[PDB]
Amino acid sequence: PRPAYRSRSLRRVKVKTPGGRTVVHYEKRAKGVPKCAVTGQPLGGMNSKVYRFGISTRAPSRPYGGVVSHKVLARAIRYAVRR
Amino acid sequence: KVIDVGRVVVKVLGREAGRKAVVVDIVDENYVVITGPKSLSGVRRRRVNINHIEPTDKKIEIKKGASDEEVLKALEAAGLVEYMKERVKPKLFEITPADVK
Amino acid sequence: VDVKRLAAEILGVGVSRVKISPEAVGRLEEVVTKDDVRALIDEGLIWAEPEKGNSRGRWRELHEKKKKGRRRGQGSRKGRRLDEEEAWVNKMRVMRRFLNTLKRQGKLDPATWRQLYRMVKGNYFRDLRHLKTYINEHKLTKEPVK
Amino acid sequence: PLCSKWESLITWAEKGGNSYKALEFREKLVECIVYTATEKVKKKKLDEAEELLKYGKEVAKKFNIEELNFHIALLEKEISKIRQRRAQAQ
Amino acid sequence: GKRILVQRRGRGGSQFRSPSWKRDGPVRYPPNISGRGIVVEILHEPGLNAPVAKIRMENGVEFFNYAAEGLYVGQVIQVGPDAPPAVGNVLPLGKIPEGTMVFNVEKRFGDGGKFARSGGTYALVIGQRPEENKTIVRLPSGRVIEVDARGRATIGIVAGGGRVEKPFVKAGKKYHRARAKSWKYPTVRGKAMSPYAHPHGGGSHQKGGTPVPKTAPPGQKVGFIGSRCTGRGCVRARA
Amino acid sequence: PKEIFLVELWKKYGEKAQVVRVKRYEDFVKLKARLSGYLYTIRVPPDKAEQLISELKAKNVKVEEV
Amino acid sequence: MKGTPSMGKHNKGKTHIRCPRCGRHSYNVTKKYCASCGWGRSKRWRRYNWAK
Amino acid sequence: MIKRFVITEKALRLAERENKITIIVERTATKKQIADEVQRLYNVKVEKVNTLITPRGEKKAYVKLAEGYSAMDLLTKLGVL
RNA sequence: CGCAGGUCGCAGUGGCAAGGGGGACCUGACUGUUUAACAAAAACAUAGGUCCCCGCGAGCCCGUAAGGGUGUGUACGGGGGC
RNA sequence: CCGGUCCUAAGGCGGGGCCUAAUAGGCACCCGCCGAAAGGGAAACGGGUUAAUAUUCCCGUGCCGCGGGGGUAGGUUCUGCGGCAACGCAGGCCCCGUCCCCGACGCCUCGGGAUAGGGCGGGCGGGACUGCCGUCCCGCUUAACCGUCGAAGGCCGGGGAGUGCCGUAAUGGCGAGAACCGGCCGAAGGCGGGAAUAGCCGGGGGUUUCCCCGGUCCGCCCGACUCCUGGGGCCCGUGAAAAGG
Ligand SMILES: [Mg+2]
Ligand SMILES: [Mg+2]
Ligand SMILES: [Mg+2]
Ligand SMILES: [Mg+2]
Ligand SMILES: [Mg+2]
Ligand SMILES: [Mg+2]
Ligand SMILES: [Mg+2]
Ligand SMILES: [Mg+2]
Ligand SMILES: [Mg+2]
Ligand SMILES: [Mg+2]
Ligand SMILES: [Mg+2]
Ligand SMILES: [Mg+2]
Ligand SMILES: [Mg+2]
Ligand SMILES: [Mg+2]
Ligand SMILES: [Mg+2]
Ligand SMILES: [Mg+2]
Ligand SMILES: [Mg+2]
Ligand SMILES: [Mg+2]
Ligand SMILES: [Mg+2]
Ligand SMILES: [Mg+2]
Ligand SMILES: [Mg+2]
Ligand SMILES: [Mg+2]
Ligand SMILES: [Mg+2]
Ligand SMILES: [Zn+2]
């Protein structure tokens, strides 16, 4: 409760209520977005801000989806074609 | 020229990535019209950027603007109707960031 | 019971601003609930003094004088007011967006734009008027810039 | 334009015979125009807002949406009062 | 009490122990790696003396190895008897040409590698005795030793050389390096102590100790421990 | 609570409403369908508003003026 | 500092709590046995002949 | 399971205003057990049970009857009122 | 932020807030630590220098033993002195 | 729907085993578990109410997990549709497996975007003072949740540049593909709905806290130590893991 608010794990948000008061709300920071398994960069189409777990994130319409970016996928397919 | 009418190509980008198709038309330098028949391999007949396809070493004989059924008889003449049914399987574990820099 | 404790929460003010009329001394000992304090507030025997806000007439008068230039001499300064680092940011942005607009429209060639763009970074020009004077004087552009 | 993604979805949805999704996409298209335009007027960026409102007039003609016309009329009325008070003080 | 600091170290207290949870794992050869692999990562490991490479083998085993100088992410290495003696390759000591520079040498096969594991260090393959299946290599100290010819070593020299050339300019810099290592920092001289605490502690003009024999018991075995000689003359006698 | 801009879409929700609330202004009327899950609100022109109340009363949906 | 000021640090910590077996304030919450009856490190009741 | 009823000033105000009967039960009785006991013993319907353990070591349950039954009627029927 | 003019006091960073300065010798390089409750130092530590025991089944240390620490380490290293 | 409860950390305990004259003594091994009311981590906000509880009671408006019903898209040998692409879109049902990612991370520094808060002018309402002047003060609010928008940054297609050319606060960038054009992904937060019906201000009637009336506005400015984003630098110092997803 209280020392769990003295740590910076949550966001201290000030808001003015309809009753005229100003109160501090403690909200969660967002979870990290999915990253590619090769370069580690965020994946397009899946990088919107999400604040709780258990939320489905629809992957892009491609083979391997939200696992690798389009650069890794296309290049790997080129190698498989020649190999 | 490698990207020419009658050439089997593997689409590398988009939803149809990894699937097989055959060039049937040439729009310009930047574009060609591919159709590996949608019943056969899963690729609809439409233009594709030539950078989004990978040519294979296998090529067939069909005239420009060849119909979809023409490509089917051509590939069965070459006995490649089964080859057009497979899909290419990448090995992502062999890729490093140097390959895509 | 403590009436001021109850009355302050009804009125939504501090206990230091709650006023109980001395005429209602007899009725204080009978009050049991907050409904009894609500009856007395309606009757006007319990109210709240308006809160104090610091008057700003002297400040508002003084602020006009400061805008005219009064009360900012050497004997009124104790620390740093002007931001030296912040001034450089505005100096580059004013001069770069001026030069970039001129080249974008075509009045300054990219070659002559480069020497002025580097002269701006090199602290050659004191301000925009100096840059305009240099551009007009040396005829770096076909039409004079205002 | 700003809500062009919703225009393409409507024609794609109607082309595939998805009457339900075309209605849902029609609602999103009206939401994209009214919400973005209504935020601009509240910030009083009338130049940005009027460009969106002019685009909304075309879309309602192109898609037969009266609710865009009704809501655009409300937003133009607000723009008139904002510009009128600006002229008075200035 | 009266036990000296070197006796207290053996108890394994927290201030004498290695914080090995700060590392990803031991840098050792897995016993059953062969074929082709890819250098997938190059990492700094806290407390270690060289950069560490992660190898993704073809069959799928991933292990940690000290990175040879010049090794890069995305490189292909060869492991096994059929590998060539190129830099970064993991080969048996039997198949290494003489005069080659190697590191992470295994004394016996399967221990994971023992010698030439610090940054800038290497071992030189001096000779071969295939009859007894030993390889003569010169360790970084200059000692020449025989190792199992079936054992494995990596080609090249360990990356990260010259690290000790730069001074530890402040006491604070060596403080932070001590926290990723096991060293107790800092250290009090023996003669700055009292006689209950050190053999050297004590007198009104504190002095060090003359050397102790090799048979001295713990608590007395501090200072020079059965040393052959001391000073510059000992250095001359060695050469 | 959710807001809907097309009356055709809102009619699907408002017809199933336990109660339809009405809030009146000069240029528009707020129609709020109270369902079991959400409260659906639409802003319509005043002339459209008395029309929508009419059939909803014919659909037996309760219409309550707020 | 070892006297009265350091006595003020004994307001929030604890070494022992009440033992379930003997009910005394002698259960060491870190060592996880009772300093009186030995519960948690000895199933037999702790009692010594040198103690009356 | 039930030990007694709470007929204090707070409990009586709750009965008239929120349809709640306040009872003292065993300390180990759960909300599922308290709702079953109230329905079985008195033949009423319980909406929800709010429970607390008093500082003196007892368990107190605020049982809200469903909206067809009178909390004050059950108090006056039992004769504990 | 600047300039010009006028003007009051004993006094204008007017209260509040707010470095005295310089030369020289001894000494420890420096920042740091220290005798809770009479010692803060010129004492300890320190970076740097150097010597010794050690190729790992090592060297040094802990344990009655089983065994353990250094060690998820390997001489650009571990330990021990000055 | 606030915490514990769950997870693992540094660590610890128990059983087996080995050791021990012996245990209530030791633990490298195997197995299990414990270990955080400041770390990781499901989901609730505003108003009202009591003598004393208030995200817990009451009102209103929601959210999470688990399960069920209907409708719908879809499926019913077999595959969802669109776009060159980045990627977009309701994207069938059940069981099992594997892999990847999120969880998941320092310090310093400088650019950008917001919000809380604060101020100025006008308007309305109410209050302060009576030597003079007529000024001074207060109210004018908007929660969670639904939708839409989205700065930086990343990416896609066209284009094919060296006499260069495009830039930053700063370092800068380009045939290993720039300028330039078009598009995709994409924060805090905004705005609409919630919601004026609440709350507040002022003016009244009744009586035990209820009812009526009006107002709840216009144009600006500053701006965080709070929130978001990106750039640069430092390390013989590299800044947890697991549940869960
Ligand atoms: Mg927590
Ligand atoms: Mg966190
Ligand atoms: Mg002054
Ligand atoms: Mg500077
Ligand atoms: Mg340590
Ligand atoms: Mg001493
Ligand atoms: Mg001696
Ligand atoms: Mg002695
Ligand atoms: Mg001595
Ligand atoms: Mg303790
Ligand atoms: Mg409870
Ligand atoms: Mg003073
Ligand atoms: Mg000193
Ligand atoms: Mg000092
Ligand atoms: Mg002392
Ligand atoms: Mg002293
Ligand atoms: Mg000293
Ligand atoms: Mg020296
Ligand atoms: Mg000496
Ligand atoms: Mg636990
Ligand atoms: Mg209280
Ligand atoms: Mg004002
Ligand atoms: Mg700068
Ligand atoms: Zn006990």
Swiss-Prot record, chain A:
Molecular functions (GO terms): structural constituent of ribosome
Keywords: Ribonucleoprotein, Ribosomal protein
A GO CC term attached to the entry: ribosome
Keyword Ribosomal protein: yes
GO biological process: translation
One Pfam family matching this protein: Ribosomal_L34e
HAMAP family: Ribosomal_eL34
Family membership noted in the UniProt record: Belongs to the eukaryotic ribosomal protein eL34 family.
Name of this protein: Large ribosomal subunit protein eL34
Organism of provenance: Pyrobaculum calidifontis (strain DSM 21063 / JCM 11548 / VA1)
Gene (name only): rpl34e
Curated annotation (Swiss-Prot), chain B:
Disulphide bond pairs: none
GO MF term list: RNA binding; structural constituent of ribosome
Keyword annotations: Ribonucleoprotein, Ribosomal protein
Highest taxon of source: Archaea
Keyword Plastid: no
SUPFAM superfamilies: Translation proteins SH3-like domain (SSF50104)
Gene3D superfamilies: 2.30.30.30
InterPro entries cross-referenced by the UniProt entry: Rib_uL2_dom2, Ribosomal_eL14, Ribosomal_eL14_arc, Ribosomal_eL14_KOW, Translation_prot_SH3-like_sf
Coiled-coil residue spans: none
Cellular component GO terms, alphabetical: cytosolic large ribosomal subunit
GO terms of biological process kind: ribosomal large subunit biogenesis; translation
Record-stated family: Belongs to the eukaryotic ribosomal protein eL14 family.
Family annotation (HAMAP family): Ribosomal_eL14
Protein name per its UniProtKB record: Large ribosomal subunit protein eL14
Name of the gene: rpl14e
From Swiss-Prot, chain E:
Assembly, per entry: Part of the 50S ribosomal subunit. Forms a bridge to the 30S subunit in the 70S ribosome.
Compositional bias segments (type: Basic residues): 1-11
Any GO BP: cytoplasmic translation
Gene3D superfamilies: 2.30.30.30, Nucleic acid-binding proteins (2.40.50.140), Ribosomal protein L2, domain 3 (4.10.950.10)
Region of interest: Disordered: 1-25, 192-224
Keywords: Ribonucleoprotein, Ribosomal protein, RNA-binding, rRNA-binding
GO cellular component, one term: cytosolic large ribosomal subunit
Function: One of the primary rRNA binding proteins. Required for association of the 30S and 50S subunits to form the 70S ribosome, for tRNA binding and peptide bond formation. It has been suggested to have peptidyltransferase activity; this is somewhat controversial. Makes several contacts with the 16S rRNA in the 70S ribosome.
Protein name: Large ribosomal subunit protein uL2
UniProt xrefs under NCBIfam families: PRK09612.1
Sequence intervals crossing the membrane: none
Keyword tRNA-binding on entry: no
Protein family per UniProt: Belongs to the universal ribosomal protein uL2 family.
Pfam hit, one: Ribosomal_L2_C
Any one GO molecular-function label of the UniProt entry: rRNA binding
